[PDB]
Amino acid sequence: LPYDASKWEFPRDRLKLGKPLGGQVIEADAFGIDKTATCRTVAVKMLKEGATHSEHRALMSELKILIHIGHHLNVVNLLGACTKPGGPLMVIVEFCKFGNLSTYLRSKRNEFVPYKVAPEDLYKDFLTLEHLICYSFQVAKGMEFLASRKCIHRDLAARNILLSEKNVVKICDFGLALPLKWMAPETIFDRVYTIQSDVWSFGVLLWEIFSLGASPYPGVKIDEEFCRRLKEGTRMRAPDYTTPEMYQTMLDCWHGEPSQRPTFSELVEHLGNLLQAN
Numbered sequence: 018l019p020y021d022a023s024k025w026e027f028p029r030d031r032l033k034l035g036k037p038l039g040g041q042v043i044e045a046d047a048f049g050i051d052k053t054a055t056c057r058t059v060a061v062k063m064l065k066e067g068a069t070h071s072e073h074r075a076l077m078s079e080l081k082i083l084i085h086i087g088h089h090l091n092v093v094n095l096l097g098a099c100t101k102p103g104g105p106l107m108v109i110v111e112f113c114k115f116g117n118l119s120t121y122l123r124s125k126r127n128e129f130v131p132y133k134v135a136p137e138d139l140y141k142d143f144l145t146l147e148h149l150i151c152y153s154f155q156v157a158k159g160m161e162f163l164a165s166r167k168c169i170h171r172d173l174a175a176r177n178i179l180l181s182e183k184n185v186v187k188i189c190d191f192g193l194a195l196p197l198k199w200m201a202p203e204t205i206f207d208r209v210y211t212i213q214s215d216v217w218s219f220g221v222l223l224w225e226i227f228s229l230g231a232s233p234y235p236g237v238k239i240d241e242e243f244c245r246r247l248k249e250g251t252r253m254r255a256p257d258y259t260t261p262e263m264y265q266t267m268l269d270c271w272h273g274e275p276s277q278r279p280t281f282s283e284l285v286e287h288l289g290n291l292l293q294a295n
């Protein structure tokens with residue numbers, strides 16, 4: 018996996034480094050990274066001061082994942098990197114103003130209606146079922162993309178979905194991986210990670226969406242009994258903002274047999290249908 022400096026290298030002196038976000042990720046403004054804007058706000062992952070060789074390797078590996086994967090609207094995309102001598106290793110990605118989707122949805126619990134009714138200004142900036150189904154559809158499209166690149170996410174969860182402007186959501190932290198609440202039974206018991214175990218996790222992500230950012234498995238200690246009951250077929254109950262069709266979609270993603278779960282291409286088609294029906 019070679020590094021194409023002519024494509025990706027960005028001058029460190031064309032960044033204004035700002036506040037920490039959320040690794041050592043900071044907000045920054047970049048000057049001339051984008052031909053349509055003089056100044057563009059970006060997120061920068063910077064190698065810690067005193068990083069070990071292993072830690073340095075790891076951030077470089079992350080950069081090469083971002084290069085290799087390619088561009089998609091629903092994935093957090095690489096804009097540039099600072100790799101040359103005279104400063105820290107820095108990985109520059111698109112900025113997602115609203116941050117992670119779990120935190121964001123929780124902030125909107127008192128600003129949700131199933132659909133707006135005229136006069137719609139009574140629901141200014143409210144979330145709706147359309148928003149939630151739309152976020153779901155977008156994540157399915159991003160995972161279909163990742164699957165097509167032979168990439169398994171391994172920790173698909175609402176905390177790893179970022180919200181940008183214009184209700185665009187972006188998957189992050191793919192290929193890098195509490196955690197047990199998103200893991201398919203085969204992952205927990207057999208340590209098998211596949212695109213079908215990501216589909217299971219997508220199911221959990223859907224529950225997080227349609228609970229407006231709740232933590233999965235409320236009231237349950239994540240221990241051997243949790244794992245045993247999951248294996249025996251027990252599943253989360255319908256969350257507070259779901260439609261019946263979306264709940265059935267969760268159940269489908271949680272089929273005990275990985276081969277009987279929908280594919281992400283099937284989920285894109287299905288959610289796209291649910292979105293037009295809604």
Ligand SMILES: COc1cc2nccc(Oc3ccc(NC(=O)NC4CC4)c(Cl)c3)c2cc1C(N)=O
Pocket residue numbers: 038039042060061062079082083093108110111112113114115116117179188189190191192193
């Ligand atoms: C406003 O809050 C945030 C905005 C962000 N925008 C873009 C990227 C972010 O963070 C990330 C999130 C992930 C990656 N890296 C990857 O996704 N790497 C994996 C693909 C190889 C990077 Cl660099 C930066 C952001 C984080 C916050 C925040 N409050 O947490």
